[PDB]
Amino acid sequence: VNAVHWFRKGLRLHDNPALKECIQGADTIRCVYILDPVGINRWRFLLQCLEDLDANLRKLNSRLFVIRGQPADVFPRLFKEWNITKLSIEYDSEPFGKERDAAIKKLATEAGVEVIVRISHTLYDLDKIIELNGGQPPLTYKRFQTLVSKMEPLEMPCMTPLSDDHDEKYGVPSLEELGFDTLSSAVWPGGETEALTRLERHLERKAWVANFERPRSLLASPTGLSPYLRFGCLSCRLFYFKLTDLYKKVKKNSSPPLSLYGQLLWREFFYTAATNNPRFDKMEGNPICVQIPWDKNPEALAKWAEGRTGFPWIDAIMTQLRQEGWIHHLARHAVACFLTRGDLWISWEEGMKVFEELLLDADWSINAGSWMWLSCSSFFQQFFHCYCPVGFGRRTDPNGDYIRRYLPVLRGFPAKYIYDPWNAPEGIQKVAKCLIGVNYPKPMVNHAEASRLNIERMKQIYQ
C-alpha cells in the first residue's frame, strides 16, 4: 500500500531494481533523499542530481522529497506519519553504509515495514566474488580479473500524494541554504539527464577509435562519466551492456577483452576490497596496509593541497582539481606520488582526505584504495614507479599549455622553463612578468634529493 524508495547513491530512474520492485504492489510511492545537517563542487553536483530527479519525477506526476535530518531519526517518524509498509534502497557495500542500513532495517521491522534491498551500484554481488576467493577479498587486480572472467553473466539492466511541498522540506535545498557562497557555472553538471547525454556522446566517441582511426586531453571531456557513475546518475550495468554492444558492433567480436572494462572493473575491485574492512581508509589497524613512518607536516600538506608547491605540473593539477572536481588519472598518479612516496613523505590518508573534499568521483572505497596503491601501501601488483614532477609533465604536454591554462601567472614563460621556471634566467622572469619567489612560489623541495632520500626510506622498510 504505502511505499518509500530511499535514494542515497543510485540517483537515477533507469536500471533502478529496488525502485522497480518497490512500486510493484504499492498504492502510493514516495521517493525520498535524506540530508545530514567537503567542497562546493561535490555539493553542487549533488544538488543538481536531486534537482534533476525532482524534474523527472514532476514529468511523472510525482516529486522528490528531500528530507532534512538524520536517517535513524527521520524514518520512524515517516513510517508512522505516512503509514509506510515498504521501504527500499540500493545496496550499499561500504562498511559504514552496511551498518547504518542494518540499523534502519531493525527499525523497519520494529514498525513492521518491509525492506527491499537490491544490488545495482556495482556489476556483481561482491559478497559472491569474495566467496569464490575463499571468503577473502582479492588483493590483486590480476586475481580479481582472473576471477570475474570466471563469473556468471548478467541480466540486462500507482501515484504520489503531494501538498504544498517546495518548502515544507521536500524541496531541493540550495548552495546558499547549505552555507555557501558565490560560484561560476560548473564543468560537470550533475544528474541522470546529463549522464545519459554523455553516455551517448561517449559511446559515439569510442566508436570513432577503432572504426575511424585518424587523429583529433588532460582536460575535462564533455563525454566523461566518472562522477555520474559515483552518484549513480549513470548505471554501471547500462554502461557495461552498451560498451559490450559497441565492441561487438565495431570490432565484430562478441567476446571482448576485459580491458574494455577496466574503468568499471577497477571500481569494483575496490568496492570488493573494502566492503569487509572498516579500517580500510586508515593506515593503523588496516590489516592490508603496510605500516609506513610518514611525516606530520601540516605546512607541506597545505602547499600541496593549495597547489603552492612551486612545481607547476603539481600546482596545475591541484588547481584544475579544486576548481572543477575532476582530474585525469595520470595527474592523480603524479600528485599522489609527490605527496607520498615520491617527494613529501606525507601519509596517503592526508591526500585521501583532500581528494574526498574536492574529487567528484571519490567513493570511500575507491579513494582509500587508490591512495593505498598509488603510495605503494597495498595491492602490491606492478610497482607504479613515480615519474618526475618536472619531466613527466614535460613529456605529456611539451608546450606546457595545460600549465598556462591552470596557472596563468606563468603564461609568459617559454616552453623550455614552463615546467621548471626557477631555472629561468632573471631576464626571462622579468619579461614573463613573474618573479619566481615573488609571484609564484619557489619549489618547496629539491626533487632529485627528495626522491633519493624517499627511495632510501622506503627500502629501509623492506630490508
How buried is 121 (Cβ within 10 angstroms: 0-12 exposed, 13-18 middle, 19+ buried)? buried
Residue 345 is placed in which grid cell?
Answer: 613523505
The domain covering 278-463 belongs, at the CATH homologous superfamily level, to DNA Cyclobutane Dipyrimidine Photolyase, subunit A, domain 3 (1.10.579.10)
Return the sign of the alpha-carbon dihedral for residues 5, 11, 13, 18: negative
User: To 5 degrees, how large is the angle CA 179–CA 180–CA 184?
Assistant: 170
Known binding positions for FAD: 226, 263, 329, 361-363
CATH number of 1-120, picked from 3.90.850.10, 1.10.1740.10, 3.40.50.620, 3.40.309.10: 3.40.50.620
Tell me the resolution in Å. 2.7
* Cell triple for 60: 511523472
Written as nine digits, the cell of 117 is 534491498
| Burial of 149 (C-beta count, 10 Å sphere; 0-12/13-18/19+) | exposed
Alpha-carbon distances, residue 331 vs 193, 237, 315, 370 (angstroms): 28, 27, 11, 13
Which of 365, 326, 367, 331 is CA-nearest to residue 350?
A: 367
Cα first-last separation, the chain = 66
Q: How far, CA to CA in Å, does 52 sit from each of 114, 201, 326?
A: 28, 19, 21
Report the binding-site residues.
226, 263, 329, 361-363
Enumerate the β-bridge partners of residue 170: 66
Phi and psi of 295, rounded to 5°? -100, 160
Closest CA to 44 of 312, 263, 215, 227: 227
What is the side-by-side strand order in the sheet with 2-7?
65-68, 28-35, 2-7, 86-90, 114-118
Topology agreement, domain 1-120 and domain 278-463: no
CATH class of the domain defined by 121-157+192-277? mainly alpha
**Residue extents of the structural domains in the chain:** 1-120, 121-157+192-277, 278-463
User: Residue 273 corresponds to which amino acid?
Assistant: A
